[PDB]
Amino acid sequence: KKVRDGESAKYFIDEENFTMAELCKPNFPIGQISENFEKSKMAKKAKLEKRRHLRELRMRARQEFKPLHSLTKEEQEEEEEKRK
DNA sequence: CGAAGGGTTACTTCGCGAACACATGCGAAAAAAACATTTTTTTATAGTAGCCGAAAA
């Protein structure tokens, strides 16, 4: 739902939320948060896009059968982006 | 009669003090040399960076 202190110390906290049981260790949103929204949200996104970037590098490296020349082809593509 | 050898007074620039108590060798280019890294041969061992599948809705 949103960030709100539902309950604690009595049962599974449910005042304004979508939780219905205890042992919330799995995903660990439980009560509410009011600290570091966007700078901590856009960190796993950056990590995930860099991992997909390295995976598509590993996929492109199958075609050109030269590893370090594929790395120089990558930096040649990014300096084509630089001249763009 | 005129150029030259001391001889001094005159203008300018450099050395000290101001009470008497109280309680607050240094820096910077390089150069011979004693020296470690860095290996690769495993290799026992835990896990810690990073990677997809069987599980739930």
Resolution (A): 4.0
The DSSP result for A21-35, as a single string, is SS--TTT---S---S
CA of A20 to C1' of B27 (A): 74
Q: Measured between alpha carbons, how far is A65 from A43 in angstroms, rounded to an integer?
A: 33
Q: Measured between alpha carbons, how far is A32 from A3 in angstroms, rounded to an integer?
A: 4
The answer to whether the beta carbon of residue A53 comes closer than 7 angstroms to any atom of strand B is no
- Contacts (Cβ under 8 Å, ≥6 apart) of A7: A13, A14, A15
Q: Measured between alpha carbons, how far is A19 from A14 in angstroms, rounded to an integer?
A: 6
Q: Measured between alpha carbons, how far is A42 from A46 in angstroms, rounded to an integer?
A: 6
CA of A70 to C1' of B35 (A): 40
How many helical (H) and strand (E) elements, i.e. helices and strands, does chain A have?
A: 2, 0
Measured to protein CB atoms, the chain B nucleotides within 7 Å are 50-52
Torsion of CA A54, A57, A58, A61, to 10 degrees: -160
Method used for this model? cryo-EM
